[PDB]
Ligand binder design. Structure first.
Ligand SMILES: Cn1nc(-c2cc(Br)c3c(c2)OCO3)cc1N
Ligand SMILES: Cn1nc(-c2cc(Br)c3c(c2)OCO3)cc1N
Ligand SMILES: [Cl-]
Ligand SMILES: [Cl-]
Ligand SMILES: [Mg+2]
Lengths: 134, 138
């Protein structure tokens, strides 16, 4: 289902990474965030929803999802709350020494994951969404 | 062409916004950045290239593009470096500015609006970029 994403957190080097996976394709958007708070989570969700058609996000339903700010951002953006991640940590592992900062390593890992190839996750998400539009 | 993006800087409230436009569709990625430096520019380009198939970026060729860090990021990602948008984006930011404490939030609401706006049975920039890239793959 083309509008469905899963949002999870993962922790490395005392920092928090949010990883959104487009369920049908395995395409990922991920960011290091300063704290696992409602404000940062809402911001992440807003960014994601401005970039891809996000209809539903499956989350862990934890503390950062209970507050006014995340609720307001999902409402505004029209989002409902209703395998790649150990791989992501593995890729960050392989590129870590090339980056001074974890955030750079995370983005190199997103690039690798989304481009790795019959199709890449990047190719899959565009094919899925294009097909839906039709 | 499907892999061609234009990257420009916009200034508001003493802050720097980078705006990348997918030339063929008008779809945008934008973010407020700490400073208009090679390191932040390279980071932005890396992020962009990990999310869409970026082959060529047309930039203003200024100071933040001369250094080793941007050059290395473009090389790694396989990218070549070869007015109304940022005006309309500025206009939407103005429209939503009072709803957010932070400029960065207003910028992302503006990206959302710009990319989803259906200008008629027309298409949005979001629909257009996916249609273009899917067509190129097929
Ligand atoms: C391996 N490969 N991957 C792509 C590709 C990569 C990313 Br990221 C994308 C995309 C297509 O559409 C949305 O994001 C194109 C080719 N040839
Ligand atoms: C108006 N409208 N816009 C979309 C839509 C919006 C965004 Br953002 C996208 C996208 C499609 O693919 C990549 O990013 C779907 C519909 N119905
Ligand atoms: Cl979370
Ligand atoms: Cl610039
Ligand atoms: Mg410029």
């Amino acid at each position: 289902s083309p509008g469905i994403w899963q949002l999870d957190c993962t922790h490395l080097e005392g920092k928090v990474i949010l990883v959104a996976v487009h369920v049908a394709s395995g395409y990922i958007e991920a960011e290091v965030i300063p704290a696992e708070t409602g404000q940062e989570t809402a911001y992440f969700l807003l960014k994601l929803a401005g970039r891809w058609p996000v209809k539903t996000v499956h989350t862990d339903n934890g503390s950062n999802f209970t507050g006014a700010t995340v609720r307001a951002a999902c409402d505004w953006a029209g989002i409902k709350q209703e395998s790649m991640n150990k791989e992501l940590k593995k890729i960050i592992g392989q590129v870590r020494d090339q980056a001074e900062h974890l955030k750079t390593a995370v983005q190199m890992a997103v690039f690798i994951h989304n481009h790795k190839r019959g199709y890449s996750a990047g190719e899959r998400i565009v094919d899925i969404i294009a097909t839906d539009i039709q």
